[PDB]
Design a binder for this molecule. Structure first.
Ligand SMILES: *[C@@H]1O[C@H](CO)[C@@H](O)[C@H](O)[C@H]1NC(C)=O
Ligand SMILES: *[C@@H]1O[C@H](CO)[C@@H](O)[C@H](O)[C@H]1NC(C)=O
Ligand SMILES: *[C@@H]1O[C@H](CO)[C@@H](O)[C@H](O)[C@H]1NC(C)=O
Lengths: 145, 48, 48, 97
């Protein structure tokens, strides 16, 4: 029974503890390098476990998450990039191994993990409740003015 | 006076906890400090 | 401007005195409010 | 002293060293070993110098190459089941060089 100016749907698969992590202004590598919500967030976050589409025999290492970022992540930012994180002072950028680490690591999932390590599927609905022409409603009646 | 919050130092609260959780504590500090200032102002008005 | 995405464009067109950037006040009428929500850092314009 | 040792114990008998009453500067581990696996779970590898820890355990044992990937929370294998099993709620980092 509300009217919203514009609705944004953001979708990604994240682990069970990360559901507790994902919330307006929290701590953790996912919350600060992978996805950050605004402090005054107005919306809903939807989480349900998906162990039938993100799991298969011999595992599935298709998904990804970032742990190495130069700074914190501004809210709603697509910082998609493959740049080696610098450690110490070496300009590396040429070879893996010591003090040259990849910004993201495989998000491998198998059908046999713990509940905190299960493939949860998360989508977040963001709404804009402001005095502006809306686009989305629900039930309606149009009684004459 | 902590006014019912974690600590009486706003800068300590800021540097120790995240924004959306220290928000309640700093709001408590605001409600305490502003109300105290209100009492001071009213008493000053009576004395004036 | 690009505050929280939501690109905004402002325009008011008038055959003003025409010397150059004038002095008299002029408000700006919005034309399009569009939620782009992408990364933006540099600016350039296209000629004829 | 845990990185400059010469007889790192085997995985079956993993020496557990208790670290207390010290300032945990991580540059000393950064400069000592050319790592190949610095995966962190409970904390950020960049963010280690700004956290105060009640107690730190340093369990050191030399192991094979694939066993480096074997050793992780919620894992399995001949080492992960009979020699050393990492807890699922592991708040810490591993270092392999
Ligand atoms: C987004 O734009 C800001 C503004 O300069 C920039 O600092 C940041 O690197 C950009 N993020 C990208 C391109 O992923
Ligand atoms: C051991 O200590 C010596 C003396 O400081 C140092 O030169 C060497 O790099 C250290 N080696 C390791 C593996 O820590
Ligand atoms: C741990 O015990 C093993 C036993 O062989 C030893 O070789 C190693 O030096 C010990 N590490 C210490 C005391 O830091």
């Amino acid at each position: 029974d509300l009217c919203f100016t514009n609705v944004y749907a953001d979708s990604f698969v994240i682990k069970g503890n990360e559901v507790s992590q994902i919330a307006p202004g929290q701590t953790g590598n996912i919350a600060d390098y992978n996805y950050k919500l605004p402090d005054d967030f107005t919306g809903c976050v939807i989480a349900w476990n998906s162990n039938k589409l993100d799991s298969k025999h011999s595992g599935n290492y298709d998904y990804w998450y970032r742990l190495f970022r130069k700074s914190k992540l501004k809210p709603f930012e697509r910082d998609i990039s493959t740049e080696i994180y610098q450690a110490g002072n070496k300009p590396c950028k040429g070879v893996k191994g010591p003090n040259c680490y990849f910004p993201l690591q495989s998000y491998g999932f198998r059908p046999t993990y713990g509940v905190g390590h299960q493939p949860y599927r998360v989508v977040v609905l963001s709404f804009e409740l402001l005095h502006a022409p809306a686009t989305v409603c629900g039930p309606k009646k149009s009684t004459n003015l | 006076s902590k006014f019912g919050a974690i600590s009486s130092v706003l800068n300590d609260i800021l540097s120790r906890l995240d924004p959306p959780e220290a928000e309640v504590q700093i709001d408590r500090l605001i409600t305490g400090r502003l109300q105290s200032l209100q009492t001071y102002v009213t008493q000053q008005l009576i004395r004036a | 401007k690009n505050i929280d995405g939501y690109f905004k464009i402002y325009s008011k067109h008038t055959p003003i005195i025409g010397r150059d950037f004038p002095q008299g006040f002029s408000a700006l009428e919005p034309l399009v409010d569009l939620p782009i929500g992408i990364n933006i850092t540099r600016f350039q314009t296209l000629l004829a | 002293e845990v990185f400059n040792a010469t007889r790192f114990a085997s995985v079956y008998a993993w020496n557990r060293t208790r670290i207390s009453n010290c300032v945990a500067d991580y540059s000393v581990l950064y400069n000592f070993a050319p790592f190949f696996a610095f995966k962190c779970y409970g904390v950020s590898p960049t963010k280690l110098n700004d956290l105060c820890f009640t107690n730190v355990y340093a369990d050191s044992f030399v192991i094979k190459g694939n066993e480096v990937s074997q050793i992780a929370p919620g894992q399995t294998g001949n080492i992960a089941d009979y020699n050393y099993k990492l807890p699922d709620d592991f708040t810490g980092c591993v270092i392999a060089w």
